[PDB]
Homo-oligomer: A and B are copies of this chain.
Amino acid sequence: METKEIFDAAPLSVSQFLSETGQGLYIPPYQRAYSWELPKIRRLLSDVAHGLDQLAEFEDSICFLGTVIALRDINYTTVEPKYRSQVPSKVMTIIDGQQRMTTLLLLTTVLHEEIRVRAEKLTRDDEPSVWCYNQALDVTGRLSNCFEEDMRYGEHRYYPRLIRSYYDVWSRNKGEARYRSPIGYYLESYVDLEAYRHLDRMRDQMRSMLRKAVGAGVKREDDIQLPTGTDIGQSQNLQFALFNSEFPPSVVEQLEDDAKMTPLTRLIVFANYLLHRVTVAVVTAKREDYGFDMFEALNTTGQPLTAIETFKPRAIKEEGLDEWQESESKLHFDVVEAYLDREGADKRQTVTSSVLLPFAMFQDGTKLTKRLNDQRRYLRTVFDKDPDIVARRKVLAGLAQVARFYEGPWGSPTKVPSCDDATLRTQAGIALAALREGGHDIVVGLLTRYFAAHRLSSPETVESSARQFLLAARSCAAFYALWRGSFGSTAGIDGVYRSLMTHVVEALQSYLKEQLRSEGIYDKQQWVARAAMTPVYQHSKPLTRLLLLAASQNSTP
């Protein structure tokens, strides 16, 4: 009867799936122990963060924690200890996604207690802040709806039939932590014990990553960016989407001050964006062998489409159409060429991410990120910000980031003006050679205005730009040598390079030196001192840069 069970696929928010009134999710006897890796959880948390984030301006935009294949066991022929009296009504045996799910439940754990204990630090009563107290109470109860249920009496299932897995006992223990009134202080959890070790650690680390995103520190290389109170309140769309109703005006302005609740409310905002706007795909097969054949049917489908391949059509079908071997077609020819050369399947994705992320800075300096979502949407927003005249420029600017990839960065470094005070060329080539070796990669986007030098009013004012570019390359490598070379590490450089693009030749030397003065690093002595106690074993490249910078000099003294 083919339209038969076989499949049954349904989209569910996390709370539709996890807070069902009868259901129980069951890890089968053949699935292994937890075994997810802190980068993969970082990725998952940052992806739901992307959902929360993109929600404020694109009213739709739904996140997607993948799919799970489950087997609707009616006859409880799966449940490990039978004890048929009190098995739940709906038992879902998770085939695939058993690792995903386990982080997700644990996420509610951190999101419960944090949101809970920050609500115990709440001011009891003062103003629209008890507003925050109820908005907490609501989400906390609604997450306790995700861990567990009530049922009859005693210990949650008869009187001696218990829960001992890593995820299982872990969840039983957070249940206990929440149940216990008394006072709301922070919690602390307690075959191969490596299982339990990894699970408890990853749980406590999710609690850490979230306790991280709550009071300033900055990170980028990790950390996930909850929109903050200062900008949660200027977006009606987030208000309504997450709380079905606009916030008290009497609350957005104590949010504007970044008050004691703006950490807690941020957690809360994330929690509701987690609980109602991120969706898992569930396929419930009702015969497990169909589950397996369907597991294969799900693992062998995809190839991939590059963000450039996914938007080319929207150029090819924007201003140019059919009779479209046109101007923007030349600008595209360039980038399709570069990608065809510097790649060939996952190589295609990493390369094109290499081109879209500096182009990001190149336009109004937004920090693009890998995710095919953000790439599709950034290219489309930028392009479609105007009419069929700036469209041309946006596309040519991708092509130009490409041209820059071919000249200076890698390639063979030589090229710029070749003769324009030739000492200057032979030395700024070192900037282009070294900056292509460590944390300076935004330097690539800012320097991508020898693109301005290539796109010039020709001979009229060509050499002036051919010179400006060398100058920027140098000053790039120099401020680099300082910041990275001088004490600390990167992330800094990266942010400040971002804003010396949006927040505004000699102009960049002045601002970059200005930022150096800001970092308490402008004034001889100090910097040399700070530099002395760095490491170099930070960047082998930086080490050699500095050694050559004290050495090569003594060829004129």
The residues of A with any CB-CB pair to B shorter than 8 Å are 1-4, 6-7, 9-13, 16, 19, 21, 28-32, 60, 62, 64-68, 74, 80-81, 84-87, 89, 96-97, 100, 133-135, 137-138, 141, 145, 150-153, 244-245, 276-277, 279, 281, 283, 287, 289-290, 292-305, 309-310, 312-313, 316-317, 322, 372-373, 376
Contacts of A2 in B (CB 8 A): 11-13, 16, 62, 276-277, 279
B137–A1 touching, CB < 8 Å: no
B16–A3 touching, CB < 8 Å: yes
Chain B residue at minimum C-beta to C-beta distance from A158: B134
A85–B245 touching, CB < 8 Å: yes
18 contacts between A and B (CB under 8 A): A2-B16, A6-B279, A7-B11, A21-B21, A60-B287, A62-B290, A64-B297, A67-B301, A80-B317, A96-B301, A100-B301, A134-B152, A137-B153, A281-B297, A292-B376, A295-B302, A295-B304, A299-B304
A373–B289 touching, CB < 8 Å: yes
A136 to B543 Cα, complex, angstroms: 76
Taking a contact as CB atoms closer than 8 A, the residue among B11, B283, B303 that contacts A3 in the complex is B11
Contacts of A133 in B (CB 8 A): 153
Excluding A6-B62, A67-B297, A84-B244, 6 further A-B contacts by CB distance (< 8 Å) are: A1-B74, A2-B16, A60-B287, A141-B150, A292-B373, A299-B304
A309–B153 touching, CB < 8 Å: no
A81 to B41 Cα, complex, angstroms: 45
Contacts of A7 in B (CB 8 A): 9-11, 281
Shortest Cβ distance from residue A246 to the other chain B in the assembled complex, whole angstroms: 8
Chain B residue at minimum C-beta to C-beta distance from A240: B84
Give the interface SS of chain A, mostly helix, strand, loop or mixed: mixed
A9–B283 touching, CB < 8 Å: yes
B293–A64 touching, CB < 8 Å: yes
B317–A29 touching, CB < 8 Å: yes
Contacts of A60 in B (CB 8 A): 287
A81 to B297 Cα, complex, angstroms: 34
A29–B281 touching, CB < 8 Å: no
Shortest Cβ distance from residue A172 to the other chain B in the assembled complex, whole angstroms: 19
Chain B residue at minimum C-beta to C-beta distance from A1: B74
A322 to B4 Cα, complex, angstroms: 34
Contacts of A289 in B (CB 8 A): 373, 376
Shortest Cβ distance from residue A18 to the other chain B in the assembled complex, whole angstroms: 11
Contacts of A96 in B (CB 8 A): 301-303
Contacts of A316 in B (CB 8 A): 29
Shortest Cβ distance from residue A248 to the other chain B in the assembled complex, whole angstroms: 9
Contacts of A295 in B (CB 8 A): 302, 304
B28–A313 touching, CB < 8 Å: yes
A298–B67 touching, CB < 8 Å: yes
A296 to B11 Cα, complex, angstroms: 15
Contacts of A12 in B (CB 8 A): 2-3
Shortest Cβ distance from residue A191 to the other chain B in the assembled complex, whole angstroms: 10
Shortest Cβ distance from residue A99 to the other chain B in the assembled complex, whole angstroms: 9
Shortest Cβ distance from residue A83 to the other chain B in the assembled complex, whole angstroms: 9
**Of residues A21, A277, A316, A317, which shows the largest number of chain B Cβ atoms within 10 Å of its Cβ?**
A21
A290 to B58 Cα, complex, angstroms: 13
A273 to B84 Cα, complex, angstroms: 20
The list of the 6 closest CB pairs from A to B, nearest first, reads A9-B9, A299-B302, A7-B11, A29-B313, A85-B245, A6-B11
Chain B residue at minimum C-beta to C-beta distance from A191: B325
A504 to B522 Cα, complex, angstroms: 92
